[PDB]
Subunit: 125 residues, 4 copies
């Protein structure tokens, strides 16, 4: 599975953080976001989806995933979703834009959502 094998592996973003992802044969993404070094308390579950039969015209493979920022010892009461595309080749990349929503009271809702972007480079199979 071409998109499946291309997406699956370890990726690192522009901030230095690490994302380990497994693309399944049914379109599922599962893995873990790790901070810049890899210690337990800095790791969070990610789950998402990808187009498991992408176009064959040179376009990338659409995908997205979510991290809720709660693990077994921390909770930032917030969730980030990355939306983007895997672009293959010797120099494969996942180009994303992201939305980070914090839980807020309705009065503070206007400032609940950060937006950003990140490019991931593959580090390992």
């Amino acid at each position: 599975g071409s998109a499946e094998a291309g997406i699956t592996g370890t990726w690192s973003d522009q901030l230095g953080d690490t994302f380990i992802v497994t693309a399944g044969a049914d379109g599922a993404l599962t893995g873990t976001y790790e901070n810049a070094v890899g210690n337990a308390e800095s790791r969070y579950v990610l789950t998402g989806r990808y187009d498991s039969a992408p176009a064959t015209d040179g376009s990338g493979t659409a995908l997205g995933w979510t991290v809720a920022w709660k693990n077994n010892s921390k909770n930032a009461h917030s969730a980030t979703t990355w939306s983007g595309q895997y672009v293959g080749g010797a120099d494969a990349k996942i180009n994303t834009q992201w939305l980070l929503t914090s839980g807020t009271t309705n009065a503070n809702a206007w400032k609940s959502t950060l937006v950003g972007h990140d490019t991931f480079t593959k580090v390992k199979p």
Copy 2:
């Protein structure tokens, strides 16, 4: 399961589409996005995450999910991620912003990502 029972159920967005979601005990979100009526060809898998121990200060519960727009008969080579928060009460709602990325060649990548927002209203447990 306060946030668990609040989120789980059937929801309707402002466009009229339906979102059936199950929030699990471990923070997973799993479900199906459908058009207005529920016809098989119009249904897509959704997977995401939410804060399963949210704050108790009146803030909403952060969450996110992804739909890759491929099912058993259609494929739009794109994925949308909703990022937002569930706000409880009798008038319960999920307020989100979303990112829809289409797979594209690198020359078209500047127009790969739509942004929007949607409020979901609960219609059934």
Copy 3:
């Protein structure tokens, strides 16, 4: 001008705030963003552009503007841009999405930008 006269006026957003705008014959937007009552210390300059010959097929009129949050007495070291479209009719609207960027250090650039949305309703011309 139809879009010129439609956009020109006083508008109020979903948060209660006030947007006073003049749409010029050449596509310029100029005005002031204030609070619910127009307290002088709460007034900021806005500048923007609009499509001064928009479609007449029922589409709205594209437009955008910027407020830098600095005035005679306050400076939040930030700027919001709104992007959207004017839709005429008896109860006219401007539907927008907005980006708010704060000056940050490189290390905090990742959280420099909030995203949201607002619908403005016309109150006076």
Copy 4:
């Protein structure tokens, strides 16, 4: 000076396009958005604002501007806004995110707006 002097000039983005901007002493931004070479049919007016007394603690200078995609010969019935911040130094940058809304009917309004990002490098 100083965010004034840093911002003012010619910038080029990641796609190769050009923006010429003047930052005014009152917080105004004015200029033109063009293509790679400055073909007249490809020029559009931009207007915006910036923080004209930014922090000095190393933070960038917040700014934003709009281009409506209509000039003397073309109209794409759309407008982009960039929101970002100017960071000085020898290799000066403006890091932005942007929103491009097209005029739509209400039925197409859900797909009216593209989002993206761009880093501008000063060229002149």
